């Protein structure tokens, strides 16, 4: 990596780490589980999971 | 009487310092598992010179003094003489054959300056002869086969004689072994460490699995 | 190997710059150090297309 | 942007480097200057087969002096460029000083094809050096000729290159055998030309040297005349390493080198430690300080 | 121009002749005729004047 980095060749950071993409798989699963489909059209309307 | 050659032959193509890399390089190399002449001091005969000459030694009180190379070797032309004392080394271009010492055997050039097992590699290249040596501490208990391992060769000693050379012949010390083997030019990937040194090679001409290596 | 299709990439593209291009040496500063700049340029011009 | 109105966002521009702020030369610290008289300056010069191999090692090697000499006129150079030779090192330079027939002059080259070129002194293809040469017609031309200089037009095979032959054994020139009996196509093979100063200009002696270099990865015994300064470490400056120049940050390393290295290469074949020729220590070259310059605007 | 400093008479050119008294640019582009002067210059005894 220091030897490509002393020619020129370099590597951007991503804009969304690691922790923002789990928060995001962590708020659909969550959305998923309470809600099913409705929060997918609009507001997430709770219903048991039964 | 032959014996195989094993993985011998690896010498330092260039004098710069790599450290850890797979480097490819082209050369005259002594090939792996080629089948090397042996010869038992009791026995000097008059050998061809090819292309290049690796001469293996395995002896406690060197016995082996130096080399007499040339072509015709009878005060006809010129004739490369290297002797060592164990004090100066002599290195001579004189025609003159000169076959007289304590120990049984114009100067337009000249140079002054079984436990044991010394390595050396002869090449004549564009009038440049090139010497490279290396010495170990090995115990073995026979001497009538090549010792298995690897080594690397460093460079030693490099002459703008500019003599065409083809016989050669080993000078013994009277009042111990050796084996002659011949390079050819082969393709190699050695291995530098991190100390740079070469710890193994790939001859990518032996076999489609070290080819597939190579490539 | 969208991992290893960077990195062998990347390091491909450092392997490149061993080649000589038909000049005669790979280092710019020793072919100023050895060359007038008149065929200096036309060595040089090799190395940079 | 090429530009006079510029949106919002984030621009890339130019990068930044930081400049080296001094310059370092270091060269070996050899003091003497280079027997160049007793090459070019000799009374009598040998012959072609009188191979006169002058080795030229731990020298100052200034080339004005040569230059500026009052017999050798011509300076031509393949590998190197002439006005750069008082600025490089090498590891040994050899000189060859013969007289030739000036018709064979343009046959000391590389590539070159002809009895001299053949059987007499033949260059290698990867020849780096310089040919000098100097019409000798006014002292190595005498009167009725000059024997001294011998001539094998015909041979077994051509020379390789930097070799020499000074057997006198006649060769059979026809298939008949010959028994070391002279005579029809069992000529003796060293003849001559005989010079005189009555000869026509292609036919003149000429007295040629030619300095074939050493240009490898060793350490240099020949230099040019350069004053070699102090070391500067852990500082971005610009470096003279025997002919290698550069810029960076020269650091102590804990590189092994081998006695014979003398420098180090990178993946990229580029150099990364070189040795300082007068104290026996290892450095590390790092490129100087740099990276991307952004630009955040509404 | 002494004839072995007349080679250095080019762009990129050294010596005593281009480094203190008559230097040519990199970018020159022009023409360099050279003529032996023999008898015109060159006289009995040296010409002082050069
Ligand atoms: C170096 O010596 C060898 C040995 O004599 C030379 O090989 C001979 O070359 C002639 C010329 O064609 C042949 O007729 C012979 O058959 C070759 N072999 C022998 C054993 O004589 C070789 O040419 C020499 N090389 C140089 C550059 O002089
Ligand atoms: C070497 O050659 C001999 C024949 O002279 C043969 O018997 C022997 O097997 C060969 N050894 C190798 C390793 O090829
Ligand atoms: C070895 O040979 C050199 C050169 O001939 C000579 O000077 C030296 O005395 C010799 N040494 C012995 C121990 O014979
Ligand atoms: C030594 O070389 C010269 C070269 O001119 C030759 O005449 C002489 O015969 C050579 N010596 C011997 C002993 O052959
Ligand atoms: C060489 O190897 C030894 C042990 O393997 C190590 O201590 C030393 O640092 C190495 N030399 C280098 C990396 O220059
Ligand atoms: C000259 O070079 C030698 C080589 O090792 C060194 O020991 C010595 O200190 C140097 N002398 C000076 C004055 O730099």
Not at chain 2, 123 to 140: A, C, E, L, M
Not at chain 4, 97 to 113: C, Y
Not at chain 4, 240 to 245: A, M, V
Request: hydrophobic share 40%; glycine share 6%.
């Amino acid at each position: 990596i220091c030897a490509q980095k002393f020619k020129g060749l370099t590597v951007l950071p991503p804009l969304l780490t690691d922790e923002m993409i789990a928060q995001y798989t962590s708020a659909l699963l969550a959305g998923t589980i309470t809600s099913g489909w409705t929060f997918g059209a609009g507001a997430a309307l709770q219903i048991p999971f039964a | 009487a032959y014996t195989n050659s094993f993985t011998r032959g690896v010498y330092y193509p260039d004098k710069v310092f790599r450290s850890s890399v797979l480097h490819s390089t082209q050369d005259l190399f002594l090939p792996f598992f080629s089948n090397v002449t042996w010869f038992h001091v009791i026995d000097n005969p008059v050998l061809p010179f090819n292309d290049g000459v690796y001469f293996a030694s395995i002896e406690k009180s060197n016995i082996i003094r130096g080399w007499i190379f040339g072509t015709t070797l009878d005060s006809k032309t010129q004739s490369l003489l290297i002797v060592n004392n164990a004090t100066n080394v002599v290195i001579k271009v004189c025609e003159f054959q000169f076959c007289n010492d304590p120990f049984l055997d114009n100067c337009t050039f000249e140079y002054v300056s079984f436990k044991n097992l010394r390595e050396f590699v002869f090449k004549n290249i564009d009038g440049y002869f090139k010497i490279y040596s290396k010495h170990t501490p090995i115990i073995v208990r026979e001497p009538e086969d090549l010792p298995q391992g690897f080594s690397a060769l460093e460079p030693l000693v490099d002459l703008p004689i500019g003599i065409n050379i083809t016989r050669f012949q080993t000078l013994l010390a009277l009042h111990a072994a050796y084996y002659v083997g011949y390079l050819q030019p082969r393709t190699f990937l050695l291995k530098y460490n991190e100390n740079g040194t070469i710890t193994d090679a790939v001859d990518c001409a032996l076999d489609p699995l070290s080819e597939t290596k190579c490539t | 190997d969208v991992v290893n299709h960077n990195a062998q990439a990347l390091n491909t593209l450092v392997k490149q710059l061993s080649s000589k291009f038909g000049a005669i040496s790979s280092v710019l500063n020793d072919i100023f150090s050895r060359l007038d700049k008149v065929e200096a340029e036309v060595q040089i011009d090799r190395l940079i297309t | 942007l090429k530009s006079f109105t510029v949106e919002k966002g984030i621009y890339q521009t130019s990068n930044f480097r930081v400049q080296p702020t001094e310059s370092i030369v270091r060269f070996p610290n050899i003091t003497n200057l280079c027997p160049f008289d007793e090459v070019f300056n000799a009374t009598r010069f040998a012959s072609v087969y009188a191979w006169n191999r002058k080795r030229i090692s731990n020298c100052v090697a200034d080339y004005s002096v040569l230059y500026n000499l009052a017999p050798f006129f011509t300076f031509k150079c393949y590998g190197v460029s002439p006005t750069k030779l008082n600025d490089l090192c090498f590891t040994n330079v050899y000189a060859d000083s013969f007289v030739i027939r000036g018709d064979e002059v343009r046959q000391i080259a590389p590539g070159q094809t002809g009895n001299i070129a053949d059987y007499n002194y033949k260059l290698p293809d990867d020849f780096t050096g310089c040919v000098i040469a100097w019409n000798s017609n006014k002292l190595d031309s005498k009167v009725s000729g000059n024997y001294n200089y011998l001539y094998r037009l015909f041979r077994k095979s051509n020379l390789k290159p930097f070799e020499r032959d000074i057997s006198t054994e006649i060769y059979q020139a026809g298939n008949k055998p010959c028994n070391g009996v002279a005579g029809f196509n069992c000529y003796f093979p060293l003849r001559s030309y005989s010079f005189r100063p009555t000869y026509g200009v292609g036919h003149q002696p000429y007295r040629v040297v030619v300095l074939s270099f050493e240009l490898l990865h060793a350490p240099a015994t020949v230099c040019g005349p350069k004053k070699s300064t102090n070391l500067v470490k852990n500082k971005c400056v610009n470096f003279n390493f025997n002919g290698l120049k550069g810029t960076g940050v020269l650091t102590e390393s804990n590189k092994k080198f081998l006695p014979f290295q003398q420098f180090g290469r990178d993946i990229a074949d580029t150099t990364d430690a070189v040795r300082d020729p007068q104290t026996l220590e290892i450095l590390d070259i790092t490129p100087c300080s740099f990276g991307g310059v952004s630009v955040i605007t509404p």
